[PDB]
Design an enzyme around this catalytic site. Structure first.
Site, PDB file in Angstrom:
ATOM      1  N   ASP A  56     -75.257   6.865 -64.783  1.00  0.00           N
ATOM      2  CA  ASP A  56     -75.863   6.326 -63.571  1.00  0.00           C
ATOM      3  C   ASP A  56     -74.843   5.370 -62.917  1.00  0.00           C
ATOM      4  O   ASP A  56     -73.757   5.113 -63.467  1.00  0.00           O
ATOM      5  CB  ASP A  56     -77.187   5.570 -63.866  1.00  0.00           C
ATOM      6  CG  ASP A  56     -76.997   4.306 -64.723  1.00  0.00           C
ATOM      7  OD1 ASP A  56     -77.864   3.405 -64.630  1.00  0.00           O
ATOM      8  OD2 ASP A  56     -76.011   4.200 -65.499  1.00  0.00           O
ATOM      9  N   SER A  87     -78.048  -0.706 -60.051  1.00  0.00           N
ATOM     10  CA  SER A  87     -78.021   0.442 -60.963  1.00  0.00           C
ATOM     11  C   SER A  87     -77.967   1.892 -60.445  1.00  0.00           C
ATOM     12  O   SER A  87     -76.899   2.430 -60.154  1.00  0.00           O
ATOM     13  CB  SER A  87     -79.215   0.281 -61.915  1.00  0.00           C
ATOM     14  OG  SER A  87     -79.317   1.344 -62.830  1.00  0.00           O
ATOM     15  N   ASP A 111     -74.361   2.050 -62.530  1.00  0.00           N
ATOM     16  CA  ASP A 111     -73.698   0.944 -63.221  1.00  0.00           C
ATOM     17  C   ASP A 111     -73.273   1.300 -64.649  1.00  0.00           C
ATOM     18  O   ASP A 111     -72.839   0.441 -65.416  1.00  0.00           O
ATOM     19  CB  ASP A 111     -74.542  -0.349 -63.178  1.00  0.00           C
ATOM     20  CG  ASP A 111     -75.872  -0.230 -63.918  1.00  0.00           C
ATOM     21  OD1 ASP A 111     -76.367  -1.266 -64.441  1.00  0.00           O
ATOM     22  OD2 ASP A 111     -76.418   0.878 -63.970  1.00  0.00           O
ATOM     23  N   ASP A 113     -74.785   2.125 -67.530  1.00  0.00           N
ATOM     24  CA  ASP A 113     -75.394   1.710 -68.769  1.00  0.00           C
ATOM     25  C   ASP A 113     -76.010   2.968 -69.397  1.00  0.00           C
ATOM     26  O   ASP A 113     -76.164   3.041 -70.603  1.00  0.00           O
ATOM     27  CB  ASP A 113     -76.468   0.630 -68.562  1.00  0.00           C
ATOM     28  CG  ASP A 113     -77.641   1.096 -67.686  1.00  0.00           C
ATOM     29  OD1 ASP A 113     -77.443   1.686 -66.603  1.00  0.00           O
ATOM     30  OD2 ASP A 113     -78.788   0.829 -68.086  1.00  0.00           O
TER      31      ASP A 113
HETATM   32 MG   LIG Z   1     -78.275   1.503 -64.872  1.00  0.00          MG
END
Ligand SMILES: [Mg+2]
Length: 455
Positions: A243, A101, A245, A247
């Site tokens: 961020d 992440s 990744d 999400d």
């Molecule tokens: Mg994330």
């Protein structure tokens, strides 16, 4: 992190804790679970972010899955929410995301998913851990080894999001948005989605690069100091940062001001609940009362769950909720994917902006005002029983206490929450009111009860 997994997946340093053997065993354990649940030949979707160790770990994980008889769809590099979306899209039996992440470049990890794309349920995750430790795998016979194929999901994902908003309204307004994707997986999606929605788009750090040259891929206010200045310098209607990744989505208004996640969550819930003419908003006990106001405004019910990853998503799913979110935002659109998806959030906010005829700052400032303060105190021992005592006292003193997750002293104007971290030896204190004074009072009220509970 609970022997194997943490709140939503597991992470660690690549080639230390997260080795190829680790990824392969996770694949063999997950595939074995899928088969033992009654599937002859499971179908699993696998995706990853831009991290440098992702390809190597993806090959290990996929090799494991195929060896235990699972067919695999490798969706390559994509935002976590896109991989969750794809898991449901391809009618898979499960999914896996290779990502750490927002963490530094040396980290990586794995997130397992339910057939509908949401984070794997704890009960099933418990079995995966057990099979992982015992290395109790159902290896396929040679003629039952799975097969893998590649699917490019970028366009399908973008199209799925666009179908959810008023593109004509957005094209008409032509909002000017600046976006920073932090060299992450969102670099492949958000800039294109925004342009296709009808926005004028300028990007910062939008070249996918697992080395994260700009900075560790975490969109906190400190890291966006320069981005905020750029938003104002360009004279953009607003800015958005994701961020690693992708999400998460963080918003910055035209004045370069960092907007709190709960505000854009409120902004989106307001539009969504109005559209449905009611419904159910799901969030945690730590979320601002602002969300209760938005819900009331449209005659929608509110469900307050414990704080923690996947809890809101799981509640939304089990209760057929309408919209969900948390303290820092992380909006979940049930009809899209039962997981936080910053790109969907940005699309909805872009639509709301294009239809408002207002400035981003106005949309935010026009929302009911609340003030909050936070504090953290180190506590050892039965840190949790300590919070229980604070509740007793509070009640004894005539206070209305909500013990859904910790001790939340409820007032008309606001509240005070005394909750013990489930990981660190801390017992944080959060407060909110419609004025800085009350917020302070409520905060102190909490500290007061805490200390007398510690003596
Ligand atoms: Mg994330």
């Amino acid at each position: 992190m609970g022997k194997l997994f943490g709140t939503f997946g597991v992470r660690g340093i690549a080639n230390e804790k997260i080795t190829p053997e680790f990824a392969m065993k996770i694949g063999m354990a997950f595939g074995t679970l899928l088969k033992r649940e009654g599937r002859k030949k499971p179908l699993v979707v696998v995706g990853r972010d831009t991290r440098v160790s992702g390809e190597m770990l993806k090959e290990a994980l996929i090799s494991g899955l195929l060896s235990v008889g699972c067919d695999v769809i490798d969706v390559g590099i994509a935002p976590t929410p896109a991989v969750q979306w794809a898991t449901k899209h391809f009618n898979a039996d499960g999914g896996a995301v290779i990502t750490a992440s927002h963490n530094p470049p040396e980290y990586n990890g794995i997130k397992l998913l339910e057939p509908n794309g949401m984070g794997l349920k704890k009960e099933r995750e418990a079995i995966v851990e057990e099979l992982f430790f015992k290395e109790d795998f159902d290896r396929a016979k040679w003629y039952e080894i799975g097969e893998v194929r590649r699917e490019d999901i970028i366009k399908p994902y973008i199209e799925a999001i666009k179908s959810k908003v008023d593109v004509e309204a957005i094209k008409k307004r032509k909002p000017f948005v600046v976006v920073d994707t932090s060299n992450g997986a969102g670099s492949l999606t958000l800039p294109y989605l925004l342009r296709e929605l009808g926005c004028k788009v300028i990007t910062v750090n939008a070249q996918p690069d697992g080395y994260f040259p700009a900075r560790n891929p975490e969109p906190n206010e400190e890291n966006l100091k320069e981005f905020m200045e750029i938003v104002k310098a360009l004279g953009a209607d607003f800015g958005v940062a994701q961020d690693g990744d992708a999400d998460r989505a963080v918003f910055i208004d035209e004045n370069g001001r960092f907007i709190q996640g709960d505000k854009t969550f409120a902004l989106v819930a307001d539009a969504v609940l109005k559209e449905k003419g009611g419904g159910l908003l799901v969030t945690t006990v730590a979320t601002s009362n602002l969300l209760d106001d938005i819900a009331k405004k449209h005659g929608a019910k509110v469900m307050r769950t414990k704080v923690g990853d996947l809890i809101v998503a799981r509640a939304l799913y089990e209760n057929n909720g309408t919209i969900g979110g948390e303290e820092n935002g992380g909006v979940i659109f049930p009809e899209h994917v039962l997981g936080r998806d910053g790109a969907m959030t940005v699309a909805k906010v872009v639509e709301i902006f294009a239809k408002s005829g207002k400035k981003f700052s106005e949309l935010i400032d026009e929302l009911p005002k609340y003030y909050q303060i936070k504090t953290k105190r180190h506590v050892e021992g039965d840190r949790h029983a300590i919070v229980n005592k604070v509740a007793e006292m509070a009640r004894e003193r005539g206070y209305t206490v909500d013990t859904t997750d910790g001790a939340k002293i409820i007032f008309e104007d606001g509240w005070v929450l005394v909750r013990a971290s489930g990981t660190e030896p801390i017992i944080r204190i959060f407060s909110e009111a419609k004025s800085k004074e009350k917020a302070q009072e409520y905060l102190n009220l909490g500290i007061e009860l805490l200390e007398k509970a510690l003596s």
